[PDB]
């Protein structure tokens, strides 16, 4: 009878808080602490909704409408949510209890529920899990639980391809166990080197590029050759195009023997350095098929800001090294640690016309959606729209699906889901 004033005052407070916390301008603060503050304010509002109003339905729906009103202002929020999820799941030492983790995941899931456009959300999942490929450093079963609870309310395709991610990892480790058992049963001398092949799939995992063809040293080349021979057996019908962008390896170097950590390209560079000293940059580039664009990250990572370990340095000490900087091999024992690693390069290498094509795609989709009007029930329209075009991969049925999904906002194509029979027929 007199609660209208309180409702209006709390709605105005929510409005001012939301316009303060959108902060489309004045950026510069740490994104992770910003997202932590977003979590804190959301949890504070949830606590206020639960403890005082006793989860009343009226207050629940009013706060939901409020959140929908002040939540659409920001755009690059799903990246922030994926970043927060990855950060929380990476370090499970603080809060190993599954209850707090699952309540955080429930908050994230309900927040994602009020939002749409999960395609960018899942491509950001792909980006974070690509750069899972390294050491696990996760909980695994928690990821399984959250993906199952997501699939319960999401459905198929994307959930099925994430299930494919997990199934691929598991079958890869079981195939590795099988290969180790085969090596133990039939002894091979070249199998003395440890092999941790982790084959992937191409239809579900993200693709980077065609990858270079960096040369393999003799012994690893023969080890991968025998692995290829084994894998062509058993189940056939597939090949293995070995990549070089990602990989973790170790090497014994010099004097106490120190164990160094290298990532693919550095291994081949050192192997080339071995057989003969006094090697210059052009000589290395001539017979290693070293990349061009991503070479920049590794070239400025092997020097120019190394830690106190100082494993390798070049005599042409300069910020830029164009063509003829001669490299030299040096002892440089320095640190007494026996597990010096260059993993820190991963902590700094991550930093730093489609117009006509997208115009043509949008125009084609729009003319297809208005022009066709042919008799369809649920799928033959998808057939005829791609029939009309002369060249393929231009249709891309996903755009037709999203167009017909967003086309239900008013009278046209607003037919009954329960019986999807009448669809304006031929009109």
């Amino acid at each position: 009878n007199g609660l209208k004033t309180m409702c209006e005052c709390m709605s105005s407070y929510l409005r001012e808080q939301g316009k303060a916390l959108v902060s489309e301008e004045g950026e510069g603060k740490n994104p992770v602490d910003y997202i932590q503050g977003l979590l804190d304010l959301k949890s504070r509002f949830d606590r206020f909704l639960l403890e005082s109003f006793n989860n009343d339905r009226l207050f629940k729906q009013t706060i939901a409408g409020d959140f929908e009103y002040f939540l659409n202002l920001n755009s690059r929020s799903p990246e922030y949510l994926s970043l927060f999820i990855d950060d929380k799941l990476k370090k499970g030492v603080k809060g190993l209890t599954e209850q707090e983790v699952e309540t955080i995941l429930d908050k994230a899931m309900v927040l994602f529920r009020f939002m749409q456009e999960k395609d960018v959300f899942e491509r950001y999942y792909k980006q974070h899990l690509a750069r899972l490929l390294t050491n696990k450093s996760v909980s695994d079963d928690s990821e399984k639980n959250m993906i199952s609870k997501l699939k319960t309310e999401c459905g198929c395709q994307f959930t099925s391809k994430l299930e494919g991610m997990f199934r691929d990892m598991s079958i890869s480790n079981t195939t590795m166990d099988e290969f180790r058992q085969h090596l133990q049963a039939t002894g091979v001398s070249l199998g003395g080197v440890d092999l941790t092949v982790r084959v992937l799939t191409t239809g579900y995992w993200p693709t980077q590029s065609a990858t270079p063809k960096c040369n393999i040293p003799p012994a690893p080349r023969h080890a991968f050759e025998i692995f290829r021979r084994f894998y062509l057996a058993k189940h056939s019908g597939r090949q293995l195009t070995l990549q070089h962008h990602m990989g973790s390896a170790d090497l014994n170097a010099t004097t106490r023997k120190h164990i160094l950590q290298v990532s693919t390209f550095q291994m081949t560079i050192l192997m080339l350095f071995n057989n003969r000293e006094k090697y210059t940059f052009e000589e290395i580039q001539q017979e290693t098929d070293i990349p061009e664009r991503e070479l920049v990250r590794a070239l400025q990572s092997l020097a120019c800001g190394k830690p106190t370990q100082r494993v390798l340095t070049k005599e042409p000490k300069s910020k830029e090294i164009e063509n003829g900087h001669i490299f030299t091999v040096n002892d440089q024992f320095t640190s007494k640690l026996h597990r010096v690693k260059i993993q820190t390069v991963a902590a700094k290498q991550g930093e730093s016309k489609v117009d006509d094509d997208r115009k043509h795609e949008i125009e084609a989709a729009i003319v297809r959606i208005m022009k066709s009007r042919k008799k369809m029930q649920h799928n033959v329209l998808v057939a005829e729209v791609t029939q009309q075009l002369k060249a393929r991969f231009l249709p891309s049925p996903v755009v037709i699906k999203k167009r017909i999904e967003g086309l239900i906002e008013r009278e046209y194509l607003a037919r009954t889901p329960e019986d999807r029979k009448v669809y304006t027929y031929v009109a």
Binding site: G92, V93, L96, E98, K136, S137, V138, S139, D140, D141, K144, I147, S148, K149, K151, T152, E163, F166, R167, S170, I171, T174, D177, K234, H235, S236, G237, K257, I259, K336, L337, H338, R339
Partner: protein, 359 residues
């Protein structure tokens, strides 16, 4: 931590023997260790595995028990699970049954008083698989009952795992009715993240139940899903699933060559699948003589299974009916013996087929 890694690697660098000198170094590492660091865990793993090569079982059990009490909260659960699996694989390759179950029940109790929902379940299911390997039934009833009580939805994976275990149990002793009940119960679940091997068994059981019951439509879908899941995982249960899929596609009035599907094209020249390849080349593009020759040339493979045998009488019948329908289209009045000649069967059976088709 600086000297920690250096000392651990100095103790590791022996790599030719273990005269308690590396063990004393690991003990010193533990003495200088802080609060449950992964370096200490890997040092304990290394010394335990290197002293497996030097027998001394009682110290194995003692320090394995202390390691299990250590793993309660010291490192991410993936690392501990991987270490447990690796140590179980290492100790299983040398048999050593008695210490094997000693380790098994010590792990059971250690995970009972430690975290239970996510770690004890996986170890218990691994024990269930190992105990199925020994087919020592009766007590497995108690094991499955205690597992069912522990799990009991938002637990789809656990329920699917226990359903697969009990389905294997009930198909071990020909419990078709209970198998159907379990298949229905698993069908009630509509959300899970199965292992690539777990779902295959239940799909095979469901396909077998559908084939035996009489419906020959969902059987192909179930068998195809089972074969698709078996392609990635395992290998022993690959040829039989393909054979059963071929039989299912045989019984459902043909329709699309099963081997033309790209997921099974390479499995054509296998001798165990060449019979099915010839059978599908004969059934498609209707040919009585080729079908009869293929059936007769391979009695050993075909007429020996308890499932193909029961469905060759339903077969060898659709093909003749199709031949009769194709031949009867242009004519309007013919002789029965003329049909008998091409159909390769007596006149009485020709009349029986004709009366059945007319009715």
């Amino acid at each position: 931590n600086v000297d920690l890694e250096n000392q651990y690697y100095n103790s590791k660098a022996l790599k030719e023997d273990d005269p308690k000198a590396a063990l004393s170094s690991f003990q010193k590492v533990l003495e200088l260790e802080g609060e449950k660091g992964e370096w200490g865990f890997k040092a304990l793993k290394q010394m335990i595995k290197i002293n497996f090569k030097l027998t001394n079982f009682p110290e194995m059990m003692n320090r394995y028990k202390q390691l299990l009490t250590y793993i309660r909260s010291a490192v991410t659960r993936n690392y501990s699970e991987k270490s447990i699996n690796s140590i179980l694989d290492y100790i299983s390759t040398s048999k050593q049954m008695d210490l094997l179950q000693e380790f098994y029940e010590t792990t059971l109790e250690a995970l009972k008083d430690a975290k239970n929902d996510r770690l004890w379940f996986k170890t218990n299911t691994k024990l269930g698989k190992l105990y199925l390997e020994r087919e020592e039934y009766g007590k497995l009833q108690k094991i499955l009952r205690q597992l069912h009580q522990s799990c009991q939805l938002k637990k789809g994976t656990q329920l699917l795992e226990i359903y697969a275990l009990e389905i294997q149990m009930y198909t071990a002793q020909k419990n078709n009715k209970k198998l159907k009940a379990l298949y229905e119960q698993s069908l009630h679940i509509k959300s899970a993240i199965p292992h690539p091997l777990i779902m295959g068994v239940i799909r095979e059981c469901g396909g077998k139940m559908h084939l035996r019951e009489g419906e020959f439509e969902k059987a192909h879908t179930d068998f195809f899903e089972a074969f698709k899941n078996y392609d990635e995982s395992g290998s022993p249960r690959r040829t039989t699933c393909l054979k059963y899929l071929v039989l299912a596609n045989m019984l459902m009035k043909s329709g699309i060559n099963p081997f033309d599907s790209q997921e099974a094209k390479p499995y054509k020249n296998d001798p165990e699948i060449l019979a099915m390849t010839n059978l599908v080349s004969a059934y498609q593009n209707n040919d009585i003589t080729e079908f009869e020759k293929i059936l007769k040339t391979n009695h050993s493979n075909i007429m020996d299974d308890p499932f193909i045998r029961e469905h060759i009488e339903e077969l060898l019948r659709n093909i003749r009916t199709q031949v009769l329908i194709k031949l009867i289209k242009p004519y309007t009045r013919i002789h029965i013996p003329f049909i008998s000649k091409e159909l390769n069967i007596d006149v009485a059976d020709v009349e029986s087929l004709l009366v059945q088709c007319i009715l």
